[PDB]
Design a protein around this ligand. Structure first.
Ligand SMILES: COc1cc(C#N)c(Oc2ccccc2C)cc1-n1c(=O)cc(C(F)(F)F)[nH]c1=O
Ligand SMILES: COc1cc(C#N)c(Oc2ccccc2C)cc1-n1c(=O)cc(C(F)(F)F)[nH]c1=O
Ligand SMILES: *Cc1c(COP(=O)(O)O)cnc(C)c1O
Ligand SMILES: *Cc1c(COP(=O)(O)O)cnc(C)c1O
Ligand SMILES: [Mg+2]
Lengths: 364, 365
C-alpha cells in the first residue's frame, strides 16, 4: 500500500506563533505551526497522512532510529517570488533521491507524487512562514525514521515519515558574500566507495561532527572532506565543491568531483553544470581534484574562484583552506567573484521567479 | 565538565509489573523489563540527577539531532544468572570505556564511567527477576546516548539524553548449540573506512548494513562477511569479530584476527579471546590482515582448521561457508571439532555463569 494526499486529516493549530525576524535567523532553530506525519506498520501498511500542530514525537526508546541510525532526510526550499507566487525548486529530484535512500535504508516505499502533494498542502497551510525577502526561504525537512521497538538489527516493521518547515534567512547576514574558511584534515573521511555518501542518510552526518568541531577550533566554518592517498577534495562540508581555474592544459575550466558514489549528487550541483554547459564560455569537467592540483595551481596564479553549492548556501565562496598547519589563501573574492556572482544571480532569478524555468513549480 | 552521581538516583518503581517471558521462547531485543534509567544533559546546566522509572516512550522534539544526523551511540553487555543463582556482569568496565570513547567521537558530553556502571547495577538489581532462570539465556543491557538538540543545524548538540534498556534474550540459536553460519561476501558494500567511526558503537555504522543483510538472507546466508579494499580483506562477520585458526604461510599454527586499524570494532569478546590465546601460549596469535586469496590459498592446502565470529550476540559462532564471486567456498570448521571454538565457548560460558571465578565478572550489588 501507499498513503494518499486525498486522505489528508488536517488538525489546524488554535494558537499561531509570532513569525521570526527575516534577517535575525539562526539556521534550523525556528519551526512553523504545522508538521506532516504518516505512520507505517508491516501489519497494516500506511495510515492516513496528518497535518497537525508541531509537537514532540512519542517514540519507544528501542526505536531503531536512535540505535542503528535507521533514518534519512531531504532538504528542499520554497521561495516567495517577486510576483509573490511561492515556488518549489526541482522538488521531484528531492522526492526521487528520498525514495532511493528509503530503499537503501530498507524503510518502506511510498508514492512520490502523494508525498510531494502532502508537502504542498503543509507549505500552503503555513505559507506566511515563506519569508517576505529576496534572500530568505522556507526550508522543508522531510524525515523518515524506523520506530521498530526492537534492538534486533533488522528491516523495521514500524516507521514514521514526517515533514518540518523552518524559515531560513540569508546564509550570511550581509546577504552579499561572507567567504568561508575550510579545515582540511585527511585523518577524517565523510564517505567511501561502497558506502552511502550519495544518499542523505543520518549516519553520513553523525561521524562528521567531530571534524566540524575541530574545524571551528582552528577558526574555520566548514570541513574540506579529503579522500584517498592523493588527498582528493570531495565536498565543502554539506555542499558540493566547485573550482574555477586555468587547468593543467592552460584552459579556463569549471571543475567539480565526479558522482562516483562518495559525492552527494546535489540539486544545486547538477543545475550549475547545466548552466555552465549552456553558457559554453569555458570547459566544464566532472574530474578528480587533489590538494596538490590546487597548491600547484595556486603557485601558478591559475586559481580564480572556489565555492560550495547546496540547498543551505546556493553559492558559498571559499577564501582559505587550513592544511598541514599552514593557511592556504584562495583568491575567490579578489576575482569578483565573477562566476560565483553570475551563478547566484541566475539561480536566484529562477528561485524567486524573476524568469520562468522548468526547474520551478508554483505551489498548488 | 562534570557527571551525574549514582548517590543522587531518584527511583520511581512501577505499580504494575509485566509478566516475565518463557526463558526457552525469547525473541532477541523484543521483550523489555519494567524499569529504564534516564539522565538529561544540557550545555547550560550539565547533567541532571539520574532516574530509574517505569519503561516509557521518549518525548523528543522532531528536530532532535538523533533523528536527522545520527547523533547517537549505544553499548551491549549482558547480566548472567549463574549456576549459584548470583547475577554477574562480564567485563562491564570495558563496555563503559568503549562507550566513553564513542561519546567523545560523537561530540556528546563525557560522564563518569564508575557512576554509569553503578546506576546500571541499581537498574539491573531492581529488575533482577528479569535475568532469566536459564544457563543459555541472559539479560541484554542497552546503554544508549542521543542528541536531543531541537535544531537542524549540523553541530555539537547542547541537549542530550542517556538512557538504559534491559531485555531478556535466549540463546543465540534455538538448539543452544553450534549452528554454523553461511556468509555473504560482496565487495560492493563496505561497513567502515580509514578515518571513519567503525571502531565505535555509533548508530551510523549499522544503518547502511541492513540492505546487505537482506541481500545475504536472499542468497541463503545468515550474515554478511564485510570486505575492505582492493585485496578484499575479511574484516567482520556481521556485527561480530572474525577469527581464523590455521597453518599460516610460514607453516605455523596461528590464531589470526584483523588488526585495530580503525575499520574493526574492538569487541569485548575479541579482547577476551586474544587474552586467552596469549595466556595459553600453545600457538601463534596474530592481529594481521587476512584476504579472501590468503583464505582460498590456505583452503587449497588444507591449512584452515576453524573460522568463527565472536560478539556479545554469539560468544563463538562457527563459519561453515562463504559465498564469493558466485561460488560457495567451504570452511572445514565443523570437520575440525571445532576444537578451539568449543574450548573458547566452554571458558567464556563457565566464567559468565560463575562455574569458575575470574577478574572478568562482577556480582550484582
Ligand atoms: C546555515 O547553515 C546550514 C544551512 C542549511 C540549509 N538549508 C544546511 O542544510 C543541510 C544540508 C545538508 C545536511 C544537513 C543540513 C541542515 C546546513 C547548514 N550548515 C549546518 O547545518 C552546519 C554547518 C557546519 F558548519 F557546522 F558544519 N554548516 C552549514 O552550512
Ligand atoms: C540475536 O541476534 C543478535 C543478538 C545480539 C546481542 N546481544 C546482537 O548484538 C548486537 C551487536 C551489534 C549491534 C547491535 C546488536 C543488537 C546482534 C544480534 N544480531 C542481530 O540483531 C541481527 C543479525 C542479522 F545479521 F542476522 F540480521 N545478527 C545478529 O547477530
Ligand atoms: C545536502 C547536501 C549537499 C547539497 O545537495 P543539494 O540537493 O544541492 O542541497 C551536498 N553535500 C552533502 C554532503 C549534503 O548533505
Ligand atoms: C558489538 C560489535 C561487535 C562485537 O563486540 P562485543 O563488545 O564483543 O559485543 C563486533 N563488531 C561490531 C561491528 C559490533 O558492533
Ligand atoms: Mg499513484
Amino acid at each position: 500500500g501507499t498513503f494518499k494526499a486525498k486522505d489528508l486529516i488536517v488538525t489546524p493549530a488554535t494558537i499561531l506563533k509570532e513569525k521570526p525576524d527575516p534577517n535575525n535567523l539562526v539556521f534550523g532553530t525556528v519551526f512553523t505551526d504545522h508538521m506532516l506525519t504518516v505512520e507505517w506498520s508491516s501489519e497494516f501498511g500506511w495510515e492516513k497522512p496528518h497535518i497537525k500542530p508541531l509537537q514532540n514525537l512519542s517514540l519507544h526508546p528501542g526505536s531503531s532510529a536512535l540505535h542503528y541510525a535507521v533514518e534519512l532526510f531531504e532538504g528542499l526550499k520554497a521561495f516567495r517570488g517577486v510576483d509573490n507566487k511561492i515556488r518549489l525548486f526541482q522538488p521531484n529530484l528531492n522526492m526521487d533521491r528520498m525514495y532511493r535512500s528509503a530503499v537503501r535504508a530498507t524503510l518502506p516505499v511510498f508514492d512520490k507524487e502523494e508525498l510531494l502533494e502532502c508537502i504542498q498542502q503543509l507549505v500552503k497551510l503555513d505559507q506566511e512562514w515563506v519569508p517576505y525577502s529576496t534572500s530568505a526561504s522556507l526550508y522543508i525537512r522531510p524525515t523518515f525514521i524506523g520506530t521498530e521497538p526492537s534492538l534486533g538489527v533488522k528491516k523495521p516493521t514500524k516507521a514514521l515519515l514526517f515533514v518540518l518547515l523552518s524559515p531560513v534567512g540569508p546564509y550570511f547576514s550581509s546577504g552579499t558574500f561572507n567567504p568561508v574558511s575550510l579545515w582540511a584534515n585527511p585523518k577524517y573521511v565523510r564517505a567511501w566507495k561502497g558506502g552511502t555518501g550519495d544518499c542523505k542518510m543520518g549516519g553520513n552526518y553523525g561521524s562528521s561532527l567531530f571534524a566540524q568541531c575541530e574545524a571551528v577550533d582552528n577558526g574555520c566554518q566548514q570541513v574540506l572532506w579529503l579522500y584517498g592517498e592523493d588527498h582528493q577534495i570531495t565536498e565543502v562540508g554539506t555542499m558540493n565543491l566547485f573550482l574555477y581555474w586555468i587547468n593543467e592544459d592552460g584552459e579556463e575550466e569549471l571543475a567539480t568531483p565526479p558522482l562516483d558514489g562518495i559525492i552527494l549528487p546535489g540539486v544545486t550541483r547538477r543545475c550549475i553544470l547545466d548552466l555552465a554547459h549552456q553558457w559554453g564560455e569555458f570547459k566544464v569537467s566532472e574530474r578528480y581534484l587533489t590538494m596538490d592540483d590546487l597548491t600547484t595551481a595556486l603557485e601558478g596564479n591559475r586559481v580564480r574562484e572556489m565555492f560550495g553549492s547546496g540547498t543551505a548556501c546556493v553559492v558559498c565562496p571559499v577564501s582559505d583552506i587550513l592544511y598541514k598547519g599552514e593557511t592556504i589563501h584562495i583568491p575567490t573574492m579578489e576575482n569578483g567573484p565573477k562566476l560565483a556572482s553570475r551563478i547566484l544571480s541566475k539561480l536566484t532569478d529562477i528561485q524567486y521567479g524573476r524568469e520562468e524555468r522548468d526547474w520551478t513549480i508554483v505551489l498548488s
